[PDB]
Amino acid sequence: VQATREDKFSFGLWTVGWQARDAFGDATRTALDPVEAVHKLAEIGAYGITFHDDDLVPFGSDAQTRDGIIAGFKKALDETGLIVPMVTTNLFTHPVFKDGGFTSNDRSVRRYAIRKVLRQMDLGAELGAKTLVLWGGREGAEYDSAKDVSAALDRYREALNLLAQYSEDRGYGLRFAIEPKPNEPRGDILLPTAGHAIAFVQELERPELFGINPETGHEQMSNLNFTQGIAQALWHKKLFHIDLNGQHGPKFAQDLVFGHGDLLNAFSLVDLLENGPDGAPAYDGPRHFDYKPSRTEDYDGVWESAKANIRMYLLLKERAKAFRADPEVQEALAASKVAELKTPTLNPGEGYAELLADRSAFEDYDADAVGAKGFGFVKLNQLAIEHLLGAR
Amino acid sequence: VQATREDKFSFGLWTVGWQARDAFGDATRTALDPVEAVHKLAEIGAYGITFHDDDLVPFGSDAQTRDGIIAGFKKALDETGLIVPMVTTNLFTHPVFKDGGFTSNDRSVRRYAIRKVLRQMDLGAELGAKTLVLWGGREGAEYDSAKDVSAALDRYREALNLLAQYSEDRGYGLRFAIEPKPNEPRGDILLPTAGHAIAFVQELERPELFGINPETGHEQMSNLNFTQGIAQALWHKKLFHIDLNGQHGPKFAQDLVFGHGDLLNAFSLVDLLENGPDGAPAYDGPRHFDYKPSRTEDYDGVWESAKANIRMYLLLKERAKAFRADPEVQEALAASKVAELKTPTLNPGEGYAELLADRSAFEDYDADAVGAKGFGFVKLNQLAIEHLLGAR
Amino acid sequence: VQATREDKFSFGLWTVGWQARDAFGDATRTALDPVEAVHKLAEIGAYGITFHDDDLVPFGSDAQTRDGIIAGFKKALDETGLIVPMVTTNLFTHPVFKDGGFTSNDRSVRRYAIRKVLRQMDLGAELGAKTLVLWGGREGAEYDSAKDVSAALDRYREALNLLAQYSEDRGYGLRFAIEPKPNEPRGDILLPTAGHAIAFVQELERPELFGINPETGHEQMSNLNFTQGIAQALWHKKLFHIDLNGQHGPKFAQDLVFGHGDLLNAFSLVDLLENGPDGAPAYDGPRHFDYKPSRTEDYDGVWESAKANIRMYLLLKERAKAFRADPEVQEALAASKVAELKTPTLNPGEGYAELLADRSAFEDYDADAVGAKGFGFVKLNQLAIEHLLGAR
Amino acid sequence: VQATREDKFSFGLWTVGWQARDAFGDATRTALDPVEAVHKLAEIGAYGITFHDDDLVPFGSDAQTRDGIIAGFKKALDETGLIVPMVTTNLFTHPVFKDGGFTSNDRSVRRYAIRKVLRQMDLGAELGAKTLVLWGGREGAEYDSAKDVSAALDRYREALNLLAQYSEDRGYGLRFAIEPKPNEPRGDILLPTAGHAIAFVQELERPELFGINPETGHEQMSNLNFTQGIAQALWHKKLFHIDLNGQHGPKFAQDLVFGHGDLLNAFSLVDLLENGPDGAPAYDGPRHFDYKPSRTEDYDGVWESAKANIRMYLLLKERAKAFRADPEVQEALAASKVAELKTPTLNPGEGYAELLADRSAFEDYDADAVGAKGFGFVKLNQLAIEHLLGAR
Numbered sequence A, B, C, D: 001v002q003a004t005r006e007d008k009f010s011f012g013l014w015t016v017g018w019q020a021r022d023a024f025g026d027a028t029r030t031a032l033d034p035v036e037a038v039h040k041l042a043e044i045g046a047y048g049i050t051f052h053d054d055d056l057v058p059f060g061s062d063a064q065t066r067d068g069i070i071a072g073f074k075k076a077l078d079e080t081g082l083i084v085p086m087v088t089t090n091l092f093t094h095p096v097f098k099d100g101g102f103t104s105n106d107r108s109v110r111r112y113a114i115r116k117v118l119r120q121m122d123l124g125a126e127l128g129a130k131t132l133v134l135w136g137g138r139e140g141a142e143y144d145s146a147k148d149v150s151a152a153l154d155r156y157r158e159a160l161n162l163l164a165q166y167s168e169d170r171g172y173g174l175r176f177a178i179e180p181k182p183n184e185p186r187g188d189i190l191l192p193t194a195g196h197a198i199a200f201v202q203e204l205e206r207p208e209l210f211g212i213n214p215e216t217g218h219e220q221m222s223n224l225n226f227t228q229g230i231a232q233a234l235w236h237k238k239l240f241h242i243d244l245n246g247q248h249g250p251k252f253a254q255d256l257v258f259g260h261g262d263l264l265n266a267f268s269l270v271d272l273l274e275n276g277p278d279g280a281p282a283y284d285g286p287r288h289f290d291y292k293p294s295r296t297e298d299y300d301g302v303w304e305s306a307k308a309n310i311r312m313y314l315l316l317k318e319r320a321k322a323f324r325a326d327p328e329v330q331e332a333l334a335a336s337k338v339a340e341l342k343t344p345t346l347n348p349g350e351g352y353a354e355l356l357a358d359r360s361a362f363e364d365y366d367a368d369a370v371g372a373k374g375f376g377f378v379k380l381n382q383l384a385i386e387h388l389l390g391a392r
């Protein structure tokens, strides 16, 4: 298969542009020119590109320099037809952000963090971005007594309400997506899982403008089921964006190509997103790859890895489709009663009074006979994997 | 120290009553008589006792027997002065619940599960319990294609809405506390963390009636920071109850005595609950121990372990207070700017307009000079620990 | 695909016979008759069966009963053509073993544990078993001060040395396989990984009679790479047996069907065992499945799951074979220099002096130029997954 | 309590000198001068300093320069009375080492890797170092098909055999300590745990010359019991060196001050190393701190964190001593039968024939009765924790 613009595959400038300087060594690749990155991505089938302010315009560029970069950038976008669906701000690299951006203990840092973001929202709005992703990588602590969490949540909320206000007043029409991460670079990061971020979002002044940007490896860093948390984000209707990559359980963030980590969870994730209710996908935003080409590769490996993300997604999609169109799979689904969960537990108009009145729900319930019937889950799982394996 | 009824130490009947049949071996202790449990707990300092329907009255007891057990149980409470602060229902042991109670694929099981809880609500209301704890230990899956998470959340919501309705109509005045757990016994449990559980509760019909009951070991099974999650729960005002125990990271649930797992986090937790604002505790509910006396122990080890839970809490309490009262700590807190996080980022009346006008927050901000100053967090952490070791 | 006796698939009687009594609930299935298990396994394609003494003869059976049971079992093997490649002893279920068998702090328990094993060695030898597997599930601790590890290792050794003495003297010709596990049921188990078990065995009296029996899920419980661990065991020539199953990282032991956990690792594993040096497998023993049919299944689900194991292994083999046979893979392997690791670093007869005199190895070496060439690893990896997916 | 040269506290140049440039941000501290480091460490009580070649002499310094630095360094040593107990080689930072040093797929890098170490050996020899630590941080892989584990071990062995040859011919008297780590920077590193490294070492040409250098945090990254692995290392007599620091379970390596991660395990570890065999320490080498001052700290924080390491050790030592001297602890130890484990299971001159003849070890053994007695382990654990908290 081949990717179409309708597939909505996007990449961060910082993914294919990662120079591969890790915590233990020097960069192994030279820097990637943004215009060149735009052209190469267009060529492999991406529909959009995203970036942190500091990825495009070097921190501290004078206004003439910044303007020049932006103009050349826009020309590339123009010529290739690529769009900018989301933009983000780097609030983690500069030493000033060592204790966080919006939640640094230092008040002045909190004021500067908000200004850095407002400036990025202007540029995002001018490039046509619809989503602002917020990754508080430095909001957290290494020691419990160093950070008042409650105060931190108050400050977090205080910054986000201002941003929504500015956006709404300027008519930018942006949606905000908080991206959870459990740890790294802080010992413990605030809003550690998709769940924590969703619960926080619900407390903002204008919750409807806020959702989450969950990343495959981030949830896997806590050994949580990514597809299942995505299912819950979809139930809340807070899946505003998604970051796809690979990870091997709890360890530093690996940022492997999507599907190269937990293959079976990648498979069930693609099934969830594309085989939504009513034939159609359950999610329609970008399919964004927030990964890193391995430190062992050169620029050839970089493009190979960019293309592997898309191939992985399309192969899994193909297998998820065949899975569902298989009359044997359908028969197994029926035997396992998956769909029966979709039927209300109470009858139409039944309340507690009528339930209490139904002796078949208790008094005459044969728990023991029901308890002995098998659900056929293993067999269902086996057919799923045989589809993934191309054995069916 | 010594426990008083104002400490509000409570224990589940299933804790000290655990016979020690694990996944790999037979019970090493005989059954504990509930009346005796009441007496023994009263003696060590507990102010209350809790239980699952099935802990007190054997599954499938005739009306006569059930009635008989309750009446003796009420007498023991009477005689001893212990209260029943919370009650819970067993929706995990019987084979009928193998796929869950409220979210079983099987509709007849969901109906039966609701019935079983209504009944315990009645008994709870009758014994004076204020909280209904809901632990969905069988809600989840081993295989992704076997459970429609969205439909399961619908069914979970549907069942809770009804319980609230009933309680309000009967005038029981119960609060409901959902208890999250990431896995075990299901491969993946629905509402895996305190975060996911708060997000969910917010979607119910009468959200003001629902909160969570987080357990130390559950969050640690995912390697999350328990104290930090409780601080978030308190920020949301959803800390309806708490289960205290010990765990050594991502592994099977150990249920050790509180403070026998992650000692540093047990210290910071006690500090957060007790050294609340306005001198007073940030949390006023029961300090409930949901732990298990090790399988290597006899009834003496059982009472020894019960007392250890109390002693650990009180020794930590004593050190958390000394910590906060130390002038050197006060000096370290100041240098760390812990309290500066409580001052709003914006001056009263400032909005984005005024922030944008402040050159000092961006254009004239010296990020480099600010980034060079240390926060003194290591020194502050070292002082906390020396207080914990009784070295200061 | 179809299983042959040459595939050497074996199953423990305790696998398909698991009644599904976990730590949180009662059994969901009835007991399986050993004779019936023998007929069913023979039928699905297994070549052998294994058992714990207590799986076949109920703990405490008189010799009359014991003898009768062995006779019937023996007939079933007879009629079916199944062999007993390995036997093991249950040193974890009975309460007496709450602190271990061989390493219990109680001296009498230690004497008893040895006797229990000698007896099982006798039955093993009578049935033609070649391997005695030792899983020290209760050897370890929940608390650091409770167990002197050094003393424990001395006692583990003392017991094993006696066992080898006896087998050698009785001429049984058995091989001993130590099975490592990090935790569960003890907080921490002695000899937690394949590495620790191999190091320990090297200290026995007759080390050549000892090896390890690593289990997929056991290594994965610590988030280790099972394939890489097996590779090391093979390098040492200590892979005496292997237990195959599935797990999803650090959590309770799941015992899923082989390949239903880390699917990518399941693939590299079959490749390692099967595409050994010169076409031939790198491993020759039994391909033993030590898994459990999920608690949600009935006997139908049980047989299904038994066959899924065989199915998974044969589908994987088939793709591992195709992977290696692919000229494009062959080309990618060359570009990544995988085979160049086989060439000695040193020239023939070259020592320190010749190497120190070689200017090209240091003084005149261009590290920067070599540091920039890519290894093409992502591309090789993508080729492997495409073969797994049946897309190549 | 104050540090003495007898305490043998040592620090790597790279610990206090870490500029806090992490995987997500720029350096927050300026470079530390080596002469300065020697002077500051001498002042806080360190008896020795260690370094990688590249920490002292910048990669690629001409001889004049290198020679100059060493002379200055030696002078500082001289003046302060500090020794160099161990030296190591940086085989991980430079891009040439991206796939490993000794086990890189590239033959030329392997050759260069050996030359770089020989050179460091000469310098170590020159400064009087006794141990060569080898941390194979880049040895491993991100993908299973990229690395032939078997060939890698052959090449790891080939290189070490040569180093020992050279040391021995030259009369250097060095001991070699392999340092295990499960992951980071590589997806999976070869020789991941203490166990894997000990097993490997037993296979070299002069094994007596090889041991391990386990690091607290590295074992904890896999959720292993650090104290328990050290106990096994001591049993094998392979604990040649130790790296002390703190970690919070499986996540990126935190490098916290010793005792700031798992405090209970830090306590059991000091007890193990100090309350050795006679009354004397069980370990006689350097107590080396391989940690990193948190990125949030300035140079005042750096010196505070250095001192914290020594203070945690001395405070734990003091409580470990008190624990063992307590009569109540003695009594708990007696009730738990800790010392009974040190008595041979067999009576002197007893073999399998005598054991088989002992009816009391089996035929007349009352397992039910023994299984009912408790070990009193919780109580023993409780007294240990109370000693730790200075509560007794």
Ligand SMILES: O=C[C@H](O)[C@@H](O)[C@H](O)CO
Residues within 6 Å of the ligand: A052, A088, A089, A133, A135, A179, A181, A215, A243, A253, A290
């Ligand atoms: O772990 C890195 C984060 O995922 C980052 O890439 C965000 O997505 C955007 O700042």
Ligand SMILES: O=C[C@H](O)[C@@H](O)[C@H](O)CO
Residues within 6 Å of the ligand: B052, B088, B089, B133, B134, B135, B179, B181, B215, B243, B253, B290
């Ligand atoms: O992990 C077991 C659960 O904690 C259980 O004890 C509940 O709190 C009550 O159903």
Ligand SMILES: O=C[C@H](O)[C@@H](O)[C@H](O)CO
Residues within 6 Å of the ligand: C052, C088, C089, C133, C134, C135, C179, C181, C215, C243, C253, C290
């Ligand atoms: O985790 C359980 C063990 O794997 C066990 O089944 C052994 O292999 C045999 O005692």
Ligand SMILES: O=C[C@H](O)[C@@H](O)[C@H](O)CO
Residues within 6 Å of the ligand: D052, D088, D089, D133, D135, D179, D181, D215, D243, D253, D290
């Ligand atoms: O994880 C960092 C390593 O521990 C390293 O510092 C070694 O000990 C020396 O190379």
Ligand SMILES: [Mg+2]
Residues within 6 Å of the ligand: A179, A215, A243, A290
């Ligand atoms: Mg991301």
Ligand SMILES: [Mg+2]
Residues within 6 Å of the ligand: B179, B215, B243, B290
């Ligand atoms: Mg609980």
Ligand SMILES: [Mg+2]
Residues within 6 Å of the ligand: C135, C179, C215, C243, C290
């Ligand atoms: Mg096994």
Ligand SMILES: [Mg+2]
Residues within 6 Å of the ligand: D179, D215, D243, D290
């Ligand atoms: Mg180290």
